[PDB]
Design a protein around this ligand. Sequence first.
Ligand SMILES: *[C@@H]1O[C@H](CO)[C@@H](O)[C@H](O)[C@H]1NC(C)=O
Length: 368
Amino acid sequence: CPVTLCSDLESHSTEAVLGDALVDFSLKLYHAFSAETNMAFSPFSIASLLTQVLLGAGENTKTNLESILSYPKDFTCVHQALKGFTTKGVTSVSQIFHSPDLAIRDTFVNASRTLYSSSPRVLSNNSDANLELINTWVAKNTNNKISRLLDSLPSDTRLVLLNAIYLSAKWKTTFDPKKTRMEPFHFSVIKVPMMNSKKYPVAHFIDQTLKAKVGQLQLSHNLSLVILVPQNLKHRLEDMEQALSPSVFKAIMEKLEMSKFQPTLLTLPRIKVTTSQDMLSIMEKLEFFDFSYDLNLCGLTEDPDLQVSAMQHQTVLELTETGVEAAAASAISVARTLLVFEVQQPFLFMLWDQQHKFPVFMGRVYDP
Ligand SMILES: *[C@@H]1O[C@H](CO)[C@@H](O)[C@H](O)[C@H]1NC(C)=O
């Protein structure tokens, strides 16, 4: 162990590599997560937290983490590339808290100020105080959509790494809320909230490989909502998903990106989804032997008694008539699992960054 080597960043190419890696990472996470219900998560927040862990990792841990994230061997410019994947529709901030008995290397301190515009903050002796500090930080950076990321903060806690994302954007064409209706849905039968518009601009086509309608609704700030729905009842969402390889996914997004928007009768489920998940436990389905038992964060601190055992992830995502709001946070911390969802007809969706070409949020609606 000796950090700090990216001085020259060729922005087209490191951008392409990183977007591609986040795509791959997104699909791996999606697939591990779908192994049957309704959820949303932010592969980008999760990648961002793990890349912060990576900034302070030693050799063996770097290796595992890079493979999980599909980053190439060499990619020292990742952190600078990742820093400029923030948009005006999407915010991303990162922060560390530590006990005063955990010394953070100066080198880690410098890198953290450069990349995150933040310095490590000190925890106090009080468990409840620390919890409010942290949870308030997250709230502050998710427009209060995530007001309680952590349930508790054990007394033995010496390190918290966090990331928080806030995405907010308007539809180019809004829906009319007098046309929004609670519509029957077959499922004890229920009613579900449905935004309707007879001539909405959707770019869409059927892909013969997924056997699926592919559609995109345009938002401001180069973000879109991308939807994949099985093309009819003969095909289940699981088959579509398993066909969704990285090459298939990328070929869809390419064709999608040249497709014209055209007036389309649209009955958009008015999705509100809140998901909390131990994402380490999902992450961990992507490697055989668990990296955490040899956790080497010598980049971050000389202290050897640091242990990573969970990662809280929470996503809140809301479609309205005016736009989308999606918040996510991820922490290396104690985690709880709760999936809150409104049942609907099956599809996958993404909030896609059409500038940097990766999924900021991904989600699934399933009809059991
Ligand atoms: C970190 O940055 C400070 C400047 O504020 C500098 O004095 C110090 O040399 C740097 N630490 C190391 C060892 O990289």
